């Protein structure tokens, strides 16, 4: 089997992407944030504290004839931006882009933090990291991909995120029309539960390539590109007036700037992030200070190839017995 679904930016900045997901019988369609940096499929639901719901579409398990309470199971998760959610668990039928999994753990939120409430466009998350990170207790649950894998034509999914435009998540096949040139595959460590790999270096604008190993994770659920402070300083040094602002929480730059590209290495191959992808717009409405899309990972504890980087590529998440990651230009 295969599946194919369109993923759409939630706003004009590509702050996140939502993909429609069918849950239950009859189908309830929710727009979920597909997140290769976590491993829980959780949703706003009829059980979510009322004051914490503001415009999201909810899953109502009592209206699904295939929903069953997973007795005794609970979940609780915290994310890198300080947000969190928790609740109980149902199993139900879940379909993405025509690919159906029966008995998928659907984690129903009883509580969500303010940032989730405040974002009316995201109805929940669909985790696509390794199932070892799933938070359900006392019996850990598998991701949608893990459950689907054995049925797929090939044990893969691909992310093809758009810049200020829709893109595609495919399951079970590689669309050879969706990229240019060849796909370069690189080793993955699953030791931390992530799609963790090592980039071979970087270049700023038309500058020379610096060969250096940068360990990080391919994370569709993170907006920006978080890299070592040395790398990030080298980038922003090429933008007149750019500086790190502790009050804003990262590098800012004059909105009048033209940003240089940023290149990262995948083996002997190179992915070029155009400068415009690195502009996240005014820090507050009407400001002429703009927020940068490349930020320091110092104090995160891990480098993160978030959407800024991934949207410049066609990315293969290869879930074969020994997982790997593939990157192509597009």
From Swiss-Prot:
- Organism, by scientific name, is Cryphonectria parasitica
Keywords from the UniProt entry: Aspartyl protease, Disulfide bond, Hydrolase, Protease, Signal, Zymogen
Q: Which positions are catalytic residues?
A: 35, 199
State the superkingdom.
Eukaryota
Q: What is the main EC category here?
A: hydrolase
Question: Which Cys residues form disulphide pairs?
Answer: 255-290
Show the catalytic activity.
Answer: Hydrolysis of proteins with specificity similar to that of pepsin A, prefers hydrophobic residues at P1 and P1', but does not cleave 14-Ala-|-Leu-15 in the B chain of insulin or Z-Glu-Tyr. Clots milk
Report where the shown chain sits in the full-length sequence: first residue, last residue, total length. Answer: 90 to 419 of 419
This chain belongs to the protein called Endothiapepsin
Molecular function terms, GO-annotated:
aspartic-type endopeptidase activity
Q: Which residues form a coiled coil?
A: none
Q: State the family it belongs to.
A: Belongs to the peptidase A1 family.
What Enzyme Commission number(s) appear in the record? 3.4.23.22
Q: Which GO terms describe its biological process?
A: proteolysis
GN (gene name): EAPA
Which positions fall inside the Peptidase A1 domain? Answer: 17-328
């Amino acid at each position: 089997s295969t599946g194919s679904a369109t993923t759409t930016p939630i706003d004009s900045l590509d702050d996140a992407y939502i993909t429609p997901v069918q849950i239950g019988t009859p189908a309830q369609t929710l727009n979920l944030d597909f997140d290769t940096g976590s491993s829980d499929l959780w949703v706003f639901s009829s059980e979510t504290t009322a004051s914490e719901v503001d415009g999201q579409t909810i899953y109502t398990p009592s209206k699904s004839t295939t929903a069953k309470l997973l007795s005794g199971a609970t979940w609780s998760i915290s994310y890198g931006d300080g947000s969190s959610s928790s609740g109980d668990v149902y199993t139900d039928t879940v379909s993405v882009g025509g690919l159906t999994v029966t008995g998928q753990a659907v984690e129903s939120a009883k509580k969500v933090s303010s940032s989730f409430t405040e974002d009316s466009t995201i109805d929940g998350l669909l985790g696509l990291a390794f199932s070892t990170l799933n938070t359900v207790s006392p019996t850990q649950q598998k991701t949608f991909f893990d459950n689907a894998k054995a049925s797929l034509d090939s044990p893969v999914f691909t992310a093809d995120l758009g810049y200020h435009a829709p893109g595609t998540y495919n399951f079970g096949f590689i669309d050879t029309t969706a990229y240019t040139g060849s796909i370069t595959y690189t080793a993955v460590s699953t030791k931390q539960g992530f799609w963790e790999w090592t980039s071979t270096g970087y270049a700023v604008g038309s500058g020379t390539f610096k060969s250096t190993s940068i360990d990080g994770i391919a994370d569709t659920g993170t907006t920006l590109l978080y890299l070592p402070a040395t790398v990030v300083s080298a980038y922003w040094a090429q933008v007149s007036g750019a500086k790190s602002s502790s009050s804003v929480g990262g590098y800012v730059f004059p909105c009048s700037a033209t940003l240089p590209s940023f290149t990262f290495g995948v083996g002997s191959a190179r992915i070029v992030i155009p400068g415009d992808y690195i502009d996240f717009g005014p820090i507050s409405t009407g400001s002429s200070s703009c927020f940068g899309g490349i930020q320091s990972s110092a104090g995160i504890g891990i480098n993160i190839f978030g959407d800024v980087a991934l949207k410049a590529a066609f990315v293969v998440f290869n879930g074969a017995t020994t997982p790997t990651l593939g990157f192509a230009s597009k």
